[PDB]
Design a protein around this motif. Structure first.
Motif, mmCIF file in Angstrom:
data_model
loop_
_atom_site.group_PDB
_atom_site.id
_atom_site.type_symbol
_atom_site.label_atom_id
_atom_site.label_comp_id
_atom_site.label_asym_id
_atom_site.label_seq_id
_atom_site.Cartn_x
_atom_site.Cartn_y
_atom_site.Cartn_z
ATOM 1 N N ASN A 146 0.820 -1.241 0.000
ATOM 2 C CA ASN A 146 0.000 0.000 0.000
ATOM 3 C C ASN A 146 0.841 1.274 0.000
ATOM 4 O OD1 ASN A 146 -2.287 -1.577 -0.098
ATOM 5 N ND2 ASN A 146 -2.850 -1.301 2.049
ATOM 6 N N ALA A 147 1.930 1.278 0.754
ATOM 7 C CA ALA A 147 2.842 2.433 0.758
ATOM 8 C C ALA A 147 3.478 2.660 -0.614
ATOM 9 C CB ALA A 147 3.913 2.277 1.828
ATOM 10 N N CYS A 148 3.857 1.576 -1.276
ATOM 11 C CA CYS A 148 4.449 1.649 -2.605
ATOM 12 C C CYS A 148 3.436 2.213 -3.634
ATOM 13 C CB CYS A 148 4.970 0.269 -3.020
ATOM 14 S SG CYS A 148 5.529 0.116 -4.728
ATOM 15 N N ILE A 149 2.217 1.677 -3.630
ATOM 16 C CA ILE A 149 1.137 2.188 -4.490
ATOM 17 C C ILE A 149 0.933 3.662 -4.195
ATOM 18 C CG2 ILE A 149 -1.374 2.126 -5.046
ATOM 19 C CD1 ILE A 149 0.111 -0.251 -6.322
ATOM 20 N N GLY A 150 0.862 4.021 -2.912
ATOM 21 C CA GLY A 150 0.743 5.425 -2.474
ATOM 22 C C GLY A 150 1.839 6.331 -3.026
ATOM 23 N N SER A 151 3.075 5.827 -3.060
ATOM 24 C CA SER A 151 4.211 6.576 -3.582
ATOM 25 C C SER A 151 4.064 6.884 -5.066
ATOM 26 C CB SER A 151 5.557 5.859 -3.303
ATOM 27 O OG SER A 151 5.801 4.724 -4.129
ATOM 28 N N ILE A 152 3.480 5.951 -5.815
ATOM 29 C CA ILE A 152 3.214 6.146 -7.242
ATOM 30 C C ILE A 152 2.177 7.259 -7.399
ATOM 31 C CG2 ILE A 152 2.374 5.148 -9.407
ATOM 32 C CD1 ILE A 152 3.385 2.378 -8.217
ATOM 33 N N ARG A 153 1.072 7.130 -6.682
ATOM 34 C CA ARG A 153 0.018 8.164 -6.682
ATOM 35 C C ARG A 153 0.521 9.565 -6.266
ATOM 36 N NH1 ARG A 153 -4.132 4.189 -3.529
ATOM 37 N NH2 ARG A 153 -3.255 5.590 -1.916
ATOM 38 N N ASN A 154 1.453 9.635 -5.316
ATOM 39 C CA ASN A 154 1.973 10.898 -4.786
ATOM 40 C C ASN A 154 3.213 11.422 -5.518
ATOM 41 O OD1 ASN A 154 0.006 10.320 -2.903
ATOM 42 N ND2 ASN A 154 1.423 10.131 -1.130
ATOM 43 N N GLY A 155 3.713 10.706 -6.517
ATOM 44 C CA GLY A 155 4.927 11.110 -7.222
ATOM 45 C C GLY A 155 6.222 11.015 -6.430
ATOM 46 N N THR A 156 6.293 10.107 -5.465
ATOM 47 C CA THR A 156 7.510 9.880 -4.685
ATOM 48 C C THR A 156 8.100 8.461 -4.919
ATOM 49 O OG1 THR A 156 6.260 9.239 -2.688
ATOM 50 C CG2 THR A 156 6.837 11.584 -2.940
ATOM 51 N N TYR A 157 7.566 7.732 -5.882
ATOM 52 C CA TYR A 157 8.037 6.387 -6.212
ATOM 53 C C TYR A 157 9.425 6.465 -6.829
ATOM 54 C CZ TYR A 157 7.989 1.974 -9.039
ATOM 55 O OH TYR A 157 8.278 0.784 -9.642
HETATM 56 C C1 LIG Z 1 0.379 9.795 -0.179
HETATM 57 O O1 LIG Z 1 -0.454 10.946 0.031
HETATM 58 C C2 LIG Z 1 -1.618 10.685 0.828
HETATM 59 C C3 LIG Z 1 -2.569 11.882 0.787
HETATM 60 O O2 LIG Z 1 -1.958 13.035 1.379
HETATM 61 C C4 LIG Z 1 -1.166 10.331 2.244
HETATM 62 O O3 LIG Z 1 -2.297 10.075 3.093
HETATM 63 C C5 LIG Z 1 -0.277 9.092 2.181
HETATM 64 O O4 LIG Z 1 0.251 8.799 3.483
HETATM 65 C C6 LIG Z 1 0.874 9.255 1.175
HETATM 66 N N1 LIG Z 1 1.545 7.963 1.071
HETATM 67 C C7 LIG Z 1 2.837 7.809 0.766
HETATM 68 C C8 LIG Z 1 3.314 6.382 0.739
HETATM 69 O O5 LIG Z 1 3.592 8.739 0.515
#
Ligand SMILES: *[C@@H]1O[C@H](CO)[C@@H](O)[C@H](O)[C@H]1NC(C)=O
Ligand SMILES: CC(=O)N[C@@H]1[C@@H](O)[C@H](O[C@@H]2O[C@H](CO[C@]3(C(=O)O)C[C@H](O)[C@@H](NC(C)=O)[C@H]([C@H](O)[C@H](O)CO)O3)[C@H](O)[C@H](O)[C@H]2O)[C@@H](CO)O[C@H]1O
Ligand SMILES: CC(=O)N[C@@H]1[C@@H](O)[C@H](O[C@@H]2O[C@H](CO[C@]3(C(=O)O)C[C@H](O)[C@@H](NC(C)=O)[C@H]([C@H](O)[C@H](O)CO)O3)[C@H](O)[C@H](O)[C@H]2O)[C@@H](CO)O[C@H]1O
Ligand SMILES: CC(=O)N[C@@H]1[C@@H](O)[C@H](O[C@@H]2O[C@H](CO[C@]3(C(=O)O)C[C@H](O)[C@@H](NC(C)=O)[C@H]([C@H](O)[C@H](O)CO)O3)[C@H](O)[C@H](O)[C@H]2O)[C@@H](CO)O[C@H]1O
Ligand SMILES: *[C@@H]1O[C@H](CO)[C@@H](O[C@@H]2O[C@H](CO)[C@@H](O[C@@H]3O[C@H](CO)[C@@H](O)[C@H](O)[C@@H]3O)[C@H](O)[C@H]2NC(C)=O)[C@H](O)[C@H]1NC(C)=O
Ligand SMILES: *[C@@H]1O[C@H](CO)[C@@H](O[C@@H]2O[C@H](CO)[C@@H](O[C@@H]3O[C@H](CO)[C@@H](O)[C@H](O)[C@@H]3O)[C@H](O)[C@H]2NC(C)=O)[C@H](O)[C@H]1NC(C)=O
Ligand SMILES: *[C@@H]1O[C@H](CO)[C@@H](O[C@@H]2O[C@H](CO)[C@@H](O[C@@H]3O[C@H](CO)[C@@H](O)[C@H](O)[C@@H]3O)[C@H](O)[C@H]2NC(C)=O)[C@H](O)[C@H]1NC(C)=O
Ligand SMILES: *[C@@H]1O[C@H](CO)[C@@H](O[C@@H]2O[C@H](CO)[C@@H](O[C@@H]3O[C@H](CO)[C@@H](O)[C@H](O)[C@@H]3O)[C@H](O)[C@H]2NC(C)=O)[C@H](O)[C@H]1NC(C)=O
Ligand SMILES: *[C@@H]1O[C@H](CO)[C@@H](O[C@@H]2O[C@H](CO)[C@@H](O[C@@H]3O[C@H](CO)[C@@H](O)[C@H](O)[C@@H]3O)[C@H](O)[C@H]2NC(C)=O)[C@H](O)[C@H]1NC(C)=O
Ligand SMILES: *[C@@H]1O[C@H](CO)[C@@H](O[C@@H]2O[C@H](CO)[C@@H](O[C@@H]3O[C@H](CO)[C@@H](O)[C@H](O)[C@@H]3O)[C@H](O)[C@H]2NC(C)=O)[C@H](O)[C@H]1NC(C)=O
Ligand SMILES: *[C@@H]1O[C@H](CO)[C@@H](O[C@@H]2O[C@H](CO)[C@@H](O)[C@H](O)[C@H]2NC(C)=O)[C@H](O)[C@H]1NC(C)=O
Ligand SMILES: *[C@@H]1O[C@H](CO)[C@@H](O[C@@H]2O[C@H](CO)[C@@H](O)[C@H](O)[C@H]2NC(C)=O)[C@H](O)[C@H]1NC(C)=O
Ligand SMILES: *[C@@H]1O[C@H](CO)[C@@H](O[C@@H]2O[C@H](CO)[C@@H](O)[C@H](O)[C@H]2NC(C)=O)[C@H](O)[C@H]1NC(C)=O
Ligand SMILES: *[C@@H]1O[C@H](CO)[C@@H](O[C@@H]2O[C@H](CO)[C@@H](O)[C@H](O)[C@H]2NC(C)=O)[C@H](O)[C@H]1NC(C)=O
Ligand SMILES: *[C@@H]1O[C@H](CO)[C@@H](O[C@@H]2O[C@H](CO)[C@@H](O)[C@H](O)[C@H]2NC(C)=O)[C@H](O)[C@H]1NC(C)=O
Ligand SMILES: *[C@@H]1O[C@H](CO)[C@@H](O)[C@H](O)[C@H]1NC(C)=O
Ligand SMILES: *[C@@H]1O[C@H](CO)[C@@H](O)[C@H](O)[C@H]1NC(C)=O
Ligand SMILES: *[C@@H]1O[C@H](CO)[C@@H](O)[C@H](O)[C@H]1NC(C)=O
Lengths: 173, 317, 317, 173, 317, 173
Positions: A146-157
């Protein structure tokens, strides 16, 4: 649409995405999920609001004009008054019809474009760690929690973190 | 194992159909209407100054028909003429009625200033049973029916200078008697003539004797004329009979005033755009309520609906 | 190690703001103005043939007011009428003045051909102190004031055929005497009448006796009329008094000529587009200088500026 | 823009590129440099010049018309003359406003398109010897000196010459 | 070894040039023409009801010129007036001819109902050698030339109520005699007068005695007038001489009728769009045949061709 | 065109393709051939037919109007009649000119788009089994007989069947 994503290579929309216009669905080791993309959503909305701002609440004041209904037959002068008005109304009616058609074609094409832009951005971000499945989905060739998927969505991957793993999975037999 | 990441977009179960360059029917997630198709059925009394004519046309309020005495000196942004309006004074016509109506409507004022014209040798203030005011025979309030005095009608040759810094509008007329005998009873000589002039204009009128159909028991008629006099110019009235004389002048203004035919009631409410059907909201760019409008109004078009897409193509599951 | 290769585009430090479908303000690298907003303040004398009316209106140049003798027989593409212009001859009006002005303006010529009308039995060439030419009493150059001779005014019944291959424009009038006595002094009988006709038209005028305000000490007036006579048709003038007779005809042409009201000086310069403010450049498609134009001109719009992008979106570092 | 390059995946423009509208910046073994791309530049300029050619120096001649200012009050005929003119001016004013908005949207989109086309062309030319970094830059996985960079810019780069070197560098651990 | 797979598109050897936003010349695979540039040179008699005026103008068919008797009571969608048309009856004019022509044209009917006017004391049915019908002196069929009887012309004072549920159009006139003597021969008194009125209108006409150029040996003239009478109103004719009286009324309708000037022959064929050049096909949205049209027609434009692309860019090998 | 395929990276069209607007040419072990793609062809044709449907056979009825030719000189009223008509004709002439230019730009761009969409779809379908040669052609790195080519055209090509073969051929020395 002219970019081929919406009603194109994306088979359909998502009725269950109610907190944005564009976004991501994933499946990984921890489950399956959805998240809206706020930047693409806002880009489309800002463009549409810009159109609306040009068209709503912008009326023009007119005062004394010409008569447009007549209780008696008169001939030449009344014929001219009537023709001037009919001419005007037909030209404005045309303008309205064309305006709406152009605006609507453009709204469809710009929203198609925003979908395509988000897809292209994600594709580039993934580098050699994923392949495009042709339907708007990427197969990611490494464990991506989930953190990895999140990084892709947030542009930090960081693609370099996973590249060795991904290349081994992609180019095996 | 790895993961799958899918990009996508929203959809709705209740989409709306719009037109584009190539498709007259395509479904989008949302749209808004650009054509105003309804009125609230009343003309809002704000923010424009509304004058409801009630039983009076503008021209009857100008001349001073007795039912219109309440209108003296009033102003308007929009004068509203009712289909029930009727004249109840001496029967008259106005050659180029539409133009006099228009110029007064656009001026936006009934402001009238009395002037002391030297009518020596004639009887003033003629009245008729066709024009009842407070149960008595009367006449148009702004006009002065001159007739013979001691079986004489000595020629009139009367001047009124304009020493104001504004234009004056004068309304006057000619009486057309029913018979050659009534011509004599009223004006003493067998034939009348009127010349009304300024330095920049002249108008010459001859009465036309004859029977017209009776209106309030009157087979004669009055024809109405007008003359504008600029600052430093002079009105000259030269006449040997049949003059329906002015009592003064109307101020003539320029501005945003107009006139509208409507039977819609006046309401206590606030709306910028007026149509004969009633006031309409003016948020939309177009409207199909009425081609006749006053104020800040959407533009009239023939379409009854034009839907602007406000979302993407709708592609349901 | 390897290499990096970056694709990119230019940007400028001084970008310009333009409008698009969705943004009323977006910065691009460059733009050009589509609305012409200035004039050079003079009307260029080339390449259109300009006729400066100076103290003369077109109608005064037509009739032949003495200050307008220099205009005889001249042509124009554009006649320029000055706000200072004034009449200095016998006082007159022209019923439908605007139409006579327009048709002469569009014809573009004052070319006049004298004709020998048979005026037997009357005095010709009447003059007045209201119309001074070379310090003497005079009259409009193109008109012939006919009066009694030996206390008689025998009826006039005069014909002029058009055997040309072009149309003739005739200008003529009626004198309106101040009094019934002046009617007699001038024309011998108490009432005049004029009938001017062709095979395809008729015009009947009766003088209207009366006082008008004095202009150059004259309380009478002349009213001006016109008649077009086609090839193979005939002008017939039948009159028992009060005729202000034509001396001939004007040629009537068709083409690109017009008239403009302006106080801008005429310059020695070359410009296709004329406005009342002066000539304007015509490179741009639109202009907001004046809705009145002549020549190859940008179209009048309400906007004071419309910027066309001529570069990409500007995205500075 | 609707193609997503200018003010999109290309973070910003280059104020120091004064000899073209689009081009290349590189870093290699011999330094770092810039060169304009003349074909893309000319393609954009030709399109813009084509628009200008339709709009500049193309005025229409009119001669005797109607009067548009009046010294006296007249009523019906003058009301009609005034309404005809006001009607005309409002329709032309609308036409001008729409024309400029459509033209400007189109100029922005066409210049965005030319940037995208040059990027796509270069991407294809590089084949398996480079990767798209997502910001309009390619990482080239082989020694690529000034002549080599020049060959890419000139369309004479032979990807086969460098492929073995590049694949070894890309797919190592 | 493997394979190669190439994506591509078609091209044609015979492409067509079109215009876009940026290029006034670009080649596409196919296009279609949007401007109709030709007519078939005849006016199709279907599906609109065509009335060919032949030698008659509409106004001559209305009044009842003898060559126009075949037109009595006919209706039309489109009345076609021919350039060869000529009048062959008593010479006349119509002040505001264009308006009477227009209102009858738009009404679309010559339906006429006779009415019994009480003309006591005068001679009816006056005729002239200028208006021959079946080799005899005659007059306009719808008009009644009244003259003296037993050297008297007693004043006329005649009423005709409108108790119908439609409007009536009345056509009437005034005879202008050549001389004061002919005035006496015809009407017994030296001066005629006409007053025609309703409750809502009045028209007063005085004859104008004088010579006009001879037409079919006639130097006098008739001037034509009209009056509309609404339901519940009344026509009142009051006259002491010179009246050319109505014989009844024309029905006045509203609808889609008109009039067109054309010399194109009428054909047995079916076409929705009529121009003076002939009928035109109406498949295209625009046309440059004629600005004058009737029916479901493409819109007139200045361009002689506008090509719509119906294929992609053509890129030949 | 704004998508860069037609008169762009596709060097030219095919005069010998007469049974469709877009399609495929191949070379393999069994020969070389051509086949039209019916879906892309139909998509373009349907859009063009939609435009035509708005413009052809849609005329408006007018009846009694004003006079537009005059046998005599009259001045003010005739000046106004003439100006009303000239004004109308110039506004409709402008409308026609703009309509055709916008429609034609759009037809060129939409047909360019359909070519691009078909190319992109095929690219994705081939996954790691082919490379884009830059001219609208793919080099397929495995034996691909007529049935195999047919499967690509029909959307039944299974990239997994050939992937091992293709990767070995692509990434050799
Ligand atoms: C990505 O951004 C969301 C929305 O601000 C935040 O809740 C989440 O923790 C972030 N995840 C990572 C893996 O950076
Ligand atoms: C001057 C005068 O007294 N004339 C008498 C005629 O009026 C009268 O004809 C009858 O008139 C009846 C109604 O008459 C008035 C009116 O309009 O009310 C009475 C007014 O006082 C008078 N006004 C003035 C200023 O003189 C006015 C005027 O004469 C007419 O309107 C002008 O046309 O008339 C009604 O119309 C009857 O039908 C009619 O017979 C005759 C006959 O009694 O005597 C005249 O002396
Ligand atoms: C026919 C004649 O001689 N009539 C005499 C009147 O003119 C005169 O009234 C005075 O006239 C003064 C100025 O007079 C002229 C003029 O306009 O200059 C003199 C002209 O020669 C004459 N023209 C012709 C062709 O006859 C002309 C004409 O009579 C009038 O303009 C027509 O209205 O008049 C000035 O206006 C004075 O204010 C006025 O009293 C009277 C009295 O002297 O005698 C008449 O015999
Ligand atoms: C009333 C009458 O008989 N008057 C005689 C004049 O008409 C006549 O003048 C000559 O008239 C010639 C042609 O005359 C007609 C016509 O238009 O055909 C004959 C008609 O019957 C008559 N109609 C009626 C209803 O009375 C008609 C009418 O008088 C005029 O048209 C009215 O202007 O005239 C032709 O025009 C000759 O050139 C002309 O001399 C004179 C002289 O003979 O005698 C009058 O008694
Ligand atoms: C000329 O013809 C007209 C029109 O027919 C005649 O007018 C009519 O005159 C009569 C008699 O005066 C009018 O009748 C009156 O009606 C009123 C009220 O309705 C009443 O108070 C009187 O006692 C009388 O009955 C009639 O209304 C009127 N008609 C019209 C249409 O106005 C006129 O009399 C004729 N003239 C001559 C000299 O014959
Ligand atoms: C304009 O006003 C002037 C001045 O009032 C009028 O002139 C006057 O007109 C009257 C009436 O016609 C004249 O009276 C007549 O005078 C003759 C003289 O021979 C006499 O015989 C008659 O019995 C009658 O009384 C009067 O002379 C005359 N006065 C002056 C000073 O000129 C004129 O009529 C008016 N014009 C119009 C169009 O109304
Ligand atoms: C009818 O009324 C008019 C208007 O009031 C009278 O006209 C006026 O007549 C007087 C006397 O002739 C004119 O005065 C003259 O002025 C000139 C120059 O300014 C001077 O040369 C003379 O010695 C005399 O003072 C006055 O200008 C004129 N007013 C107007 C406005 O035109 C007319 O006299 C009256 N008629 C009768 C018969 O009473
Ligand atoms: C059009 O021109 C003709 C011809 O000049 C005019 O007819 C003539 O009019 C004069 C003046 O009214 C007539 O003179 C009068 O004649 C009677 C005869 O009884 C006599 O008693 C009078 O003392 C006076 O002299 C003349 O007879 C007449 N001539 C002819 C040949 O018909 C006509 O007046 C002119 N029409 C107009 C509208 O000006
Ligand atoms: C007033 O002037 C007019 C115009 O010059 C004169 O009219 C002309 O009158 C003569 C004599 O009647 C007409 O001649 C006739 O022509 C017909 C057929 O062409 C013929 O049947 C007769 O025998 C005679 O020759 C001439 O046509 C006519 N001219 C015009 C243009 O209408 C009129 O006679 C003059 N009046 C007086 C009283 O002098
Ligand atoms: C409208 O119609 C009425 C009624 O017919 C007309 O009134 C009548 O007019 C005639 C002709 O002028 C008059 O005749 C004259 O009467 C006097 C009386 O003193 C006599 O001296 C004359 O010899 C002549 O016969 C008649 O009196 C009169 N009748 C009535 C009942 O009023 C009127 O003229 C017509 N109006 C128009 C504009 O045509
Ligand atoms: C506003 O008023 C106008 C004018 O009365 C209405 O248009 C009329 O509608 C009637 C009934 O459908 C038609 O028979 C007429 O042809 C129309 N009249 C005119 C003069 O065009 C209109 O329907 C009203 N609109 C609303 C929203 O109330
Ligand atoms: C146009 O008219 C003006 C004003 O009437 C003329 O200028 C005047 O001429 C008079 C007469 O010679 C002089 O006494 C004045 O000095 C001038 N007055 C003013 C206010 O300038 C001018 O000459 C006329 N122009 C033409 C071309 O004839
Ligand atoms: C050209 O002349 C016109 C007409 O005089 C000018 O428009 C007038 O401007 C004044 C002053 O701002 C306003 O009060 C008027 O409303 C305008 N007049 C009319 C008739 O519209 C215009 O400003 C001038 N333009 C230039 C560039 O000189
Ligand atoms: C329309 O008028 C023309 C011309 O007046 C008529 O044709 C003439 O008829 C006369 C009389 O019978 C003949 O003598 C001639 O041979 C014809 N002349 C010409 C020049 O053609 C025609 O008959 C009339 N048409 C209708 C339908 O009545
Ligand atoms: C249809 O008729 C019109 C009007 O007659 C024709 O336009 C005229 O063409 C002539 C000859 O080229 C010109 O001299 C005139 O200027 C035009 N007349 C008018 C009134 O504009 C037009 O050519 C005809 N069109 C077709 C297709 O037959
Ligand atoms: C669609 O449905 C939603 C949910 O019921 C409702 O709130 C909304 O107003 C509808 N809107 C449109 C544009 O159909
Ligand atoms: C590329 O083209 C440029 C410009 O013409 C030229 O100067 C350069 O030598 C070329 N370089 C190569 C490596 O082809
Ligand atoms: C592909 O489709 C075509 C057309 O229907 C058909 O003839 C062919 O047999 C198919 N080939 C394969 C390999 O699926």
């Amino acid at each position: 649409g002219i970019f081929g994503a919406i009603a194109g290579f994306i088979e359909n929309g998502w009725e269950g995405m109610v907190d944005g216009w564009y976004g991501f669905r994933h499946q990984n080791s921890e489950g399956r999920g959805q998240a809206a993309d706020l930047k693409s959503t806002q880009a489309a909305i800002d463009q549409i609001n810009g159109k609306l701002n040009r068209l709503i609440g912008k009326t023009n004041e007119k005062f004394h004009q010409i008569e447009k209904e007549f209780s008696e037959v008169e001939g030449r002068i009344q014929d001219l008054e009537k023709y001037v008005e009919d001419t005007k109304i037909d030209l404005w009616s045309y303008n309205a019809e064309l305006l709406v058609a152009l605006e609507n074609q453009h709204t469809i094409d710009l929203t198609d474009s925003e979908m395509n832009k988000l897809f292209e951005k994600t594709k580039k971000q993934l580098r050699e760690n994923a392949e495009d499945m042709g339907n708007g989905c990427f197969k990611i060739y490494h464990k991506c929690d989930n953190a990895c998927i999140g990084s892709i969505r947030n542009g930090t991957y960081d693609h370099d973190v996973y590249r060795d793993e991904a290349l081994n999975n992609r180019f095996q037999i | 194992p790895g993961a799958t990441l899918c990009l996508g977009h929203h959809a709705v179960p209740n989409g709306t159909i719009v037109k584009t360059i190539t498709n007259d029917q395509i479904e989008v997630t949302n749209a808004t209407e650009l054509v105003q198709n309804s009125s609230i059925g009343e003309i809002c009394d704000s923010p424009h100054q509304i004058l409801d004519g009630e039983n009076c046309t503008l021209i009857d309020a100008l001349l001073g028909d007795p039912q219109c005495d309440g209108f003296q000196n009033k102003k308007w942004d929009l004068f509203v003429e009712r289909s029930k309006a009727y004249s109840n004074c001496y029967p008259y016509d106005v050659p180029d009625y539409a133009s006099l109506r228009s110029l007064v409507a656009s001026s936006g004022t009934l402001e009238f200033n009395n002037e002391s014209f030297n009518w020596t040798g004639v009887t003033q203030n003629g009245t008729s049973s066709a024009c009842i005011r407070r149960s008595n025979n009367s006449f148009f309030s702004r006009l002065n029916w001159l007739t013979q005095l001691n079986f004489k009608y000595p020629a009139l040759n009367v001047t009124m200078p304009n020493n104001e810094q504004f234009d004056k509008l004068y309304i006057w007329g000619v009486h057309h008697p029913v018979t050659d005998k009534d011509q004599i009873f009223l004006y003493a000589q067998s034939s009348g003539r009127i010349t009304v002039s300024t330095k920049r204009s002249q108008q010459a009128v001859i009465p036309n004797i004859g029977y017209r159909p009776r209106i309030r028991n009157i087979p004669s008629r009055i024809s109405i004329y007008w003359t504008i006099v600029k600052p430093g110019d002079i009105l000259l009235i030269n006449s040997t009979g049949n003059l329906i004389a002015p009592r003064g002048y109307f101020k003539i203004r320029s501005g945003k005033s107009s006139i509208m035919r409507s039977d819609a009631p006046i309401g206590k409410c606030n709306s910028e755009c007026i149509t004969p059907n009633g006031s309409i909201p003016n948020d939309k760019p177009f409207q199909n309520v009425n081609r006749i409008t006053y104020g800040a109004c959407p533009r009239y078009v023939k379409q009854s609906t034009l839907k602007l897409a406000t979302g993407m193509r709708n592609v349901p599951e």
